[PDB]
Design a binder for this molecule. Sequence first.
Ligand SMILES: Cc1cccc(C)c1-c1noc(C(C)C)c1COc1ccc(-c2ccc3cc(C(=O)O)ncc3c2)cc1
Lengths: 11, 229
Amino acid sequence: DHQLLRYLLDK
Amino acid sequence: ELTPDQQTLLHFIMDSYNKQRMPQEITNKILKEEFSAEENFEILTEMATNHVQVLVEFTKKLPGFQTLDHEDQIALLKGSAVEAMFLRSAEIFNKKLPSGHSDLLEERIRNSGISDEYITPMFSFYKSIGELKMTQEEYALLTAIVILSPDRQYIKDREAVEKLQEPLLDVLQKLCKIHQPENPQHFAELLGRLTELRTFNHHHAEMLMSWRVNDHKFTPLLEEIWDVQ
Ligand SMILES: Cc1cccc(C)c1-c1noc(C(C)C)c1COc1ccc(-c2ccc3cc(C(=O)O)ncc3c2)cc1
């Protein structure tokens, strides 16, 4: 769950 | 008595506070576009999403943030999302930031489906916080503080968050004595707003509900950060 936030941190 | 250890910390923050930037082409749409209840909303939503990214780039660059637990990192971003946004928009109106277009941003907010019940206090807040005559440091430091508030819901390791906030709060009190010796209650005035911001978080849940029932698509990023089905 909550892909986009996780993605924004890792990017 | 600003120690060099702290003089460097603040400088890291204030550079980040100008480093993660909202594009001009996007914010120009506050001025450029037509002024209708439909358009006002579309615009405000566009501003918000773009800002949610800017806040994530900023939060990432906060000292000792990436060292935190991956699970808690979401719960903080999620909890301080609206409050950080409320704090930045307050800086728009108060300090009249050119790229923010205060007067026209205010026209859109005041005509975007939002109830008088939530408009009155929202702007009462802007007025009062304005009167604090707050500096870009005080704005930037509160932001870091609101993001790293340990007492957010669905957190596990609050002691590790407390360790990250304390450092900022110490530095802020120092600045309230340095630049505001006349009034020692100034550090308390800044902290008073942290509580005022919280009350708007409740207001915001109801605001989103009103838009939803009136068919107002948000964005996958906002819908995530705030939880919208
Ligand atoms: C209506 C409201 C009030 C307070 C808080 C919220 C989340 C809402 C609120 N609640 O919902 C919404 C949408 C979903 C309709 C909003 C609208 O929020 C925002 C958030 C940010 C900005 C904004 C505008 C200009 C900026 C310029 C610059 C720059 O020049 O550097 N930087 C950042 C900027 C950010 C505008 C509206």
